[PDB]
Amino acid sequence: VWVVGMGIVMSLIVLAIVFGNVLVITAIAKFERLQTVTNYFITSLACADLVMGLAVVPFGAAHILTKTWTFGNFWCEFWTSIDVLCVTASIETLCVIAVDRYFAITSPFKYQSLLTKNKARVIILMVWIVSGLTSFLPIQMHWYRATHQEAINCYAEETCCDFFTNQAYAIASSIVSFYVPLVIMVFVYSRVFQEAKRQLQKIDKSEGRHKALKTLGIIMGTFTLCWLPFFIVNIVHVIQDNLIRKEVYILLNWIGYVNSGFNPLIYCRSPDFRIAFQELL
Ligand SMILES: CN[C@@H]1CCc2c(ccc(O)c2O)[C@H]1O
């Protein structure tokens, strides 16, 4: 009776993920006003989320719901590669938009000539290139396989799909995909909050005839509680401890998919963008 029960949630998530990006892509495509410099980064994030939801979520849900994998193992390598690539692309896009906000707040005069529409495209292309390289190159060249005789049959056989990684690769991947964006975002947001507090104090100096924290409170919090634990797990099993189980690993990886799906809708709200949605509907 649980098979039908778990199917409903997966189907709802799959239906919602694509609709949460088609609307934004279509609205930003055919509206002149919504076009801006940060709009390119927003579209990059939305397209990455759409690709993730259209590619990895349905097949992964089919694998989880079914007893055993259906087709051959030839496509599995870049299935996993696309998964890791989209995750890295989303994380790095959030890091770069945070850096953009930091540059916007601190130096107003330089921002006019520092960033240009022509120069902005280079950053997105470079980050896509580096994420795609660090995703495809290790996965496809079979540099991530392990030597332990356990599950080597699963790697050899074309009927089961389990994720097994070497000690070295996991740590480097976690460091290059999670920790650096986290520290950069934390530092830049601390600086932004300090600037906002200073401005509020200056305004209060001449008055009499912190709400903004809430605006920050979500934008980082939903990132932490939804992505901090998994990578913390993604290292410990490399250590000699056998504490975690496969089901827990699968569930913590799964939660990240829902987090990535829900991120862009919460991230981008504006009266102009709201009326942009309104006109299309
Ligand atoms: C099988 N799922 C994978 C397993 C490990 C992993 C993921 C995503 C980004 C990474 O940097 C990873 O090391 C997960 O999506």
Distance 38 CA to ligand 1 centre (A): 28
Q: With b meaning 16 or more CB within 10 Å and e meaning fewer, what string describes 231-263?
A: beebeebeeeeeeeeeeeeeebbbebbebbbbb
Provide the token pair at 49: 């989320």
Is the Cα dihedral 48, 51, 56, 58 positive or negative?
positive
In angstroms, what CA-CA distances link 68 with 2, 57, 59, 159, 160? Answer: 17, 17, 12, 7, 6
Determine contact, residues 105/192, Cβ cutoff 8 Å.
Answer: yes
Determine contact, residues 254/13, Cβ cutoff 8 Å.
Answer: no
Which DSSP state fits 148?
S
How many Cα atoms are found within 13 Å in the side-chain-facing hemisphere of 83? Answer: 17
Determine contact, residues 138/84, Cβ cutoff 8 Å.
Answer: no
Query: Can you say how many angstroms the Cα of residue 240 is from the centroid of all Cα atoms in its chain?
Result: 29
For residues 252 and 233, what is the distance between their CA atoms, to the nearest angstrom? 9
Distance 271 CA to ligand 1 centre (A): 37
Ligand 1 neighbours (beta carbon < 6 A): 80, 83-84, 87, 163, 170, 173, 177, 234, 253
Residue carrying structure tokens 């396989």:
145
* Nearest-atom index, ligand 1, CA of 177: 11
Experimental method: cryo-EM
234 is in an annotated binding site: yes
* Nearest-atom index, ligand 1, CA of 174: 11
**Residue from 261, 271, 258 nearest 22 by CA:** 261
SS3 240: coil
For residues 255 and 226, what is the distance between their CA atoms, to the nearest angstrom? 7
| Angle at CA of residue 225, ends 236 and 45, nearest 5° | 105
Here the CATH number for the domain that contains residue 24 is 1.20.1070.10
In angstroms, this model's resolution equals 4.1
Q: Where are the alpha helices (DSSP H) in the chain?
A: 2-29, 37-65, 76-106, 108-114, 117-140, 152-156, 167-174, 180-205, 212-236, 246-267, 271-280
Determine contact, residues 161/76, Cβ cutoff 8 Å.
Answer: yes
Provide the token pair at 237: 């099993």
**Phi-psi group of 3: left, alpha or beta (phi > 0 → left; psi -120 to 50 → alpha; rest → beta):** alpha
Taking the alpha carbons at both ends of the chain, their separation in whole angstroms is: 39
Determine contact, residues 160/68, Cβ cutoff 8 Å.
Answer: yes
Provide the token pair at 109: 């005069």
* Domain coverage including residue 74: 2-280
Q: Domain total for the chain?
A: 1
In the chain, residues preceding a discontinuity (C to N beyond 2.5 A) are: 209
Distance 269 CA to ligand 1 centre (A): 30
**Residue from 147, 210, 146, 174 nearest 87 by CA:** 174
